[model samples]
Target: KVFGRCELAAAMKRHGLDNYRGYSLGNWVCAAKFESNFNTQATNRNTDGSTDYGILQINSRWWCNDGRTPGSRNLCNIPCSALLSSDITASVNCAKKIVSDGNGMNAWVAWRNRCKGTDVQAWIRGCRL
Candidate 1:
């Protein structure tokens, strides 16, 4: 995993996501914690037969293609596997696109369910941004 939350924050900052689209770094960190615990290799199978990929848990239904799945919108135009890399470049890029689509962090169910209206500041506590 990351060295800690601060490392994750640093990476997010490097990718220009620290305060993207009116969401704070705390919001992103909190969402990542609930989404995939900051593990880039994480994946989850949804009951709808779609799969979530990587740290942000992007869905295959609209974001990326998982070859075995049919009828994916594949809006990201990248393979789902690309998001599972230890390097989060593709995942971050795709997440940025998702936020830019006007959904903001609400695009992630975990963000809505766990992080929404929560005190996300602790996510970056002691992390000297």
Candidate 2:
């Protein structure tokens, strides 16, 4: 399922992503848009052979165990396939862990590339902060 922008924001907020790790709601919303385009089934295989999965595009090499990435650290200790669910509960929880285990939301390269310098408020409903 591909979530609409406003709906995605609300969804993530309701799922407990609002201001998570000091990352504003729009930061998550914008990252979701750019990372997986809010598609629950999105998957991208990197040249390093690691695959990114689901709405947050959680990676296989370090986060979830897709059983594909070499060494498959599986830091989140979950099967990457679970992240493909439209419910987003796993995605949100695992994302929280990603931020906790790493430094911040900047762990997502797409977030750093776009949501960093870009005004995150632009991702909120009608761009409301």
Candidate 3:
């Protein structure tokens, strides 16, 4: 619902995410691809009863409130629905906070499981950034 690979590169650059918080754009792109396939409306229910929301697949236990999920910390102070929109501003902001909290991209399981130590150039190939 949000971006193709190239569009995402442009958008990330526009949002100044090319090298944000010491992480590369390739890392973000790779994580996004594996997490949500760049779909802003993507949501996944974790086996632990928490849910992941949006492109970055932020967890409800810490980032956003789904309302139905009790004990959600809502550290980002935004509704989970805000992350499901195509705008991406709220989701990106929340992701920035998550990374800055010392988790880096390790906050995302997809990043740790798939992107770590992998060559991520294909995520941004021909993006012309």
Candidate 4:
């Protein structure tokens, strides 16, 4: 079963910090909330036809999948997808990499603000500060 907020925190504590810098717990939570409303199976297509998939909604189509990688629909790496499939902790960590690169969650922030979700904190409970 997928864990919730506090459970996620415990998993992060166990996994330790990621390679990417400035990856705060609050920021991670905010990014998850922003990405998929904390849902694990979220999947959608961007206007450009790129497919965002899984918990962090990693756009596997745009990032690392295509005709070259067979059966790669909305999938990250095989290992990552395997880890994330059963563990929200792993999923959040995977997303941190994508967000810290300034490629994924940044777009969500802009889109939500433009759509009138100006209070980022209100948009995601842990986003403030």
Candidate 5:
């Protein structure tokens, strides 16, 4: 439920991440836990009726309305939603592109620190698949 361990492990394998382990997935799960409690279809609204959607709490309107991009990654150019869509490989790939492209694990490590002690422990520990 949380980390989706077996599924994510397979995804990591598909992405040739056997040596990579659970670092990025852990951070992503942490992000979701902090953002939306791992609710894939979750959404939130502001007083103005604006909304954020999906696990990462992506502000769909930013891309869908403000002409930002589209969906989460295309709109925000962050692509965090790729992970929430259950495409764990894509999500990790996108996160690697955005968060660790140049800085490497340092950025991801920082994000993990921020999301620590939340429900993300399941991901960090690679518990539930």
Candidate 6:
């Protein structure tokens, strides 16, 4: 699903991203915009040959197993394919794990460059919840 801007903002809040890891709803929305364009089916292959999967573009190298990333930790313990669906429960859960692992939202370069240490209200302004 390619979500609307406000739709994604509201959905992320429902999934407990309101202030997870000290980042606000706008932070999450901004990251998703740059990371996946709010596309549930988005995927990208990294230069390291590890593919990033789904809405948040989670890397297969350590987050999820795609059966191809050498020495994949698959710390989320699920196939990376699970993230490609519109249902974001799994994505949210896995994202929390990544954040709590000490990287916080820094795991995504987009977050660091576009969302972090900046004003993200423009990304989620109309999302009421």
- Best lDDT goes to which candidate? 6
In candidate 6, how many Å is residue 89 off? 0.7
Candidate 1 lowest-lDDT run of ten: 1-10
lDDT of 3: 0.87
The per-prediction CA RMSD against the true structure, in angstroms, equals 1.3, 1.8, 1.1, 5.6, 6.3, 0.9
The models' CA-based lDDT, in order, is: 0.86, 0.89, 0.87, 0.50, 0.48, 0.90
Q: What's the TM-score of each model vs. the native?
A: 0.93, 0.93, 0.94, 0.57, 0.44, 0.96
List runs of model 6 lying over 4 Å from the truth: none
Model 4 ranges off by over 4 Å: 17-20, 66-76, 79-84, 89-93, 99-129
lDDT (Cα, tens digit) per residue for candidate 6, span 2-67:
999999988888999879978888888889999999999999999989999988999999999898
After TM-score superposition, the amount by which residue 101's alpha carbon in candidate 3 deviates from its true location, in angstroms, is 1.2
Candidates ranked by lDDT, best first?
A: 6, 2, 3, 1, 4, 5
Give stretches of model 1 more than 4 Å off. 1-3
Residue ranges of candidate 3 with Cα displaced over 4 Å: none
Query: Highest TM-score, which number?
Result: 6
Better candidate by lDDT, 3 or 6: 6
Model 1: per-residue lDDT, tens digit, 1-129? 442688888788888887789888989889888889888888899988899998889999899999756787899989999998877788888988999998778899889999989999889889977
* Model 3: per-residue Cα lDDT over 15-129, one tens digit each: 7777898778888899999999999999999887989999899999888988877777999999999999888789888988998998688888899999988888777888888
In model 4, which residue pairs have backbone atoms overlapping below 3 Å?
Answer: none
Better of 1 and 3 by TM-score: 3
